[PDB]
Each structure stands twice: as C-alpha cells, then as structure tokens.
C-alpha cells in the first residue's frame, strides 16, 4: 500500500558524476567510459553571456584549460569537442563504475528520476516530469548545472535530461545527452520564458487508477462520457487532450480495477467541475499529473 513520488535508485548514476571547471566556472559532468559530458556554456564569461559564438570560444580553448575531478583523482582531458549545447572532454581513463546506459530523448508527460549535483558531489534525489511546455518543475541551486535526469530499465539507465538553466518563473530548461534542448530555449542571455503549460490528461487518470488500488473510490461516479465529450471539458480547464492510444495504454490499469477509462474520465470530469470539495485523493488536494501509466503500475502492482 501507499503512493509517493518515487525515484529510481541513484548509484549507478553516482559513480558516473565529476566536477568540470573552465576558469573560475565549476559545474557538473557526466563521466561514461573515457568521455565527460557538460553544459557548453563552462566555456562562457559573464562579459559574452549576451550572444556567446560557443565555437570560437571553444576553438580558443585547450584539454588543459578543462580541470576535470572525479572526487579526489584529477581526470586527465586528452581531447574536447561539441555537439550541440553539450561538451564532450575526452579523458585518458574510462570510468570503471560506468553503467550499462544509453542516450534516449522522452517526450513531454514523461517523468524522470533527477540526481541534484554540486561540485560533481550528489546532494539528493526527486521525480521530475518533462512539462508540455518543454520545463520541468526542479528544485537546484547555483552550480547544479550539468545534473542528469534518468530512468533505469533492469540494469540499463536511459540518460534523459541534462540541466543547463533557470527561467524567470523558477522552472528548469536542458537538453538531451545529445545536446539539443527540450523546449524553445536557448544557451545565451535572452528574454525567453515558459509558454503557458497545460496538465497532462492521461497522468492524472493513471493517479485516480492509483487511488482506486489504494482504496480511494469517493470521487467514482456511475456515469461513463465519450472520448469527444471528455476532451471538450479536458479543452476548456487546459488538460491536454486524451487520445485512442491513451485509453489503450490505461487498459491494464482499466483491467486491475475493472473500471473502463472512459468510466474514470466521468470522474475526472466531475472533479474539474465541482473540484474536491474539501476531500484529497492519495494525500493530494490537487488532481496530480506527474505519475505516468508505468509509474502507477511500477508501484501499485
Ligand atoms: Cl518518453
């Protein structure tokens, strides 16, 4: 029993974290066999931060202007290149605690485990979706750029995110391992900012499929609506729209609690219209959106 916000277990992405430093600019890498992963934007100074030309700055660069320290033991760069907003420093040693990994790119209402990084030192673990609007809602401070977010499938961690920047509401921009951005943003100085996000439709309904396994049942109704009416109402309280292929892959939920999707979205309904009337689902007030499908049955099963 129970429901909490859980993240994968972090080591094997530990053993994988290092300082990256680049004149008096420190932030974290990603060290796999003999390459370390970072933020391009190590390279910058406060005086270019406007409209940086990364590749001039770089082509300026040598291996020995990279100080790269995996705890104590200094990593020797024999090597740097760019590929896209990401540095790659090639080292002389592979990573012996390297992990069984692969660079996948998710899509927005996906969620991913992030290992909040400082001085290449790990300071906590937190579940974190990939927002509609390409944010994700984190919580790091100064010098946590270069903290990965990641899944692992049986011994495999699928790397997902790397941390480049704060936006004015708060809300966090990075890219994939292979260096291009989630979202519209940018690594340089601009006026760039969240657009307006929605809430992700078929997470909430794999949250009320968690709560009815956890024997939350108050907010279950008689009534069953049809994909088109439910999308009209979805529509109206900015819910993403809920597609055939959604309700297919709630089916093994549907199945377990032998209440039919469309069964749950005449709940769904009624609550974005009445709201929870004082009550909570899963210790919640809110209607929840950071729980897929496969979290649900990962911890409900
Ligand atoms: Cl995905």
């Known amino acids: 029993s129970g429901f909490r916000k859980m993240a994968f ?25 003999d ?35 995996a705890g104590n033991v200094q ?56 927002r509609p609007n390409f944010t994700i809602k984190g919580s790091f401070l100064n010098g946590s750029c270069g903290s990965v977010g990641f899944n692992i499938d049986y011994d495999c961690v699928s790397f997902c995110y790397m941390h480049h920047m704060e936006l004015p509401t708060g809300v966090h921009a990075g890219t994939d391992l292979e260096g291009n951005f989630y ?40 009534f069953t609506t049809t994909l088109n009416d439910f999308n009209l109402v979805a529509m109206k309280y900015n819910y993403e729209p809920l597609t055939q292929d959604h309700v297919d892959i709630l089916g093994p939920l549907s199945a377990q609690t032998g209440i039919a999707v469309l069964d749950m979205c005449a709940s769904l309904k009624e609550l974005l219209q009445n709201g929870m009337n004082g009550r909570t689902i899963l210790g919640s007030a809110l209607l929840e959106d950071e729980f897929t499908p496969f979290d649900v049955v990962r911890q409900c099963s």
């Open 9 to 33: 277990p972090s080591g094997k992405v530990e053993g994988c974290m290092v300082q990256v430093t680049c004149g008096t600019t420190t932030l974290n890498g990603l060290w796999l066999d």
């Open 35 to 69: 390459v370390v992963y970072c933020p391009r934007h190590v390279i910058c100074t406060s005086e270019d931060m406007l409209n940086p030309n990364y590749e001039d700055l770089l082509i300026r660069k040598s291996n020995h202007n990279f100080l790269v320290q």
């Open 75 to 130: 990593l020797r760069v024999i090597g740097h290149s760019m590929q896209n907003c990401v540095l790659k420093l090639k080292v002389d040693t592979a990573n012996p605690k390297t992990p069984k990994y692969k660079f996948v790119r998710i899509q927005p209402g996906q969620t991913f485990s992030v290992l909040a990084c400082y001085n290449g030192s790990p300071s906590g673990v937190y579940q974190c979706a990939m």
């Open 183 to 222: 979202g519209p943003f940018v690594d340089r100085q601009t006026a760039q900012a969240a657009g307006t996000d929605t809430t992700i439709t078929v997470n909430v309904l794999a949250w009320l499929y968690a709560a009815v396994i956890n024997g939350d049942r108050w907010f279950l109704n008689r």
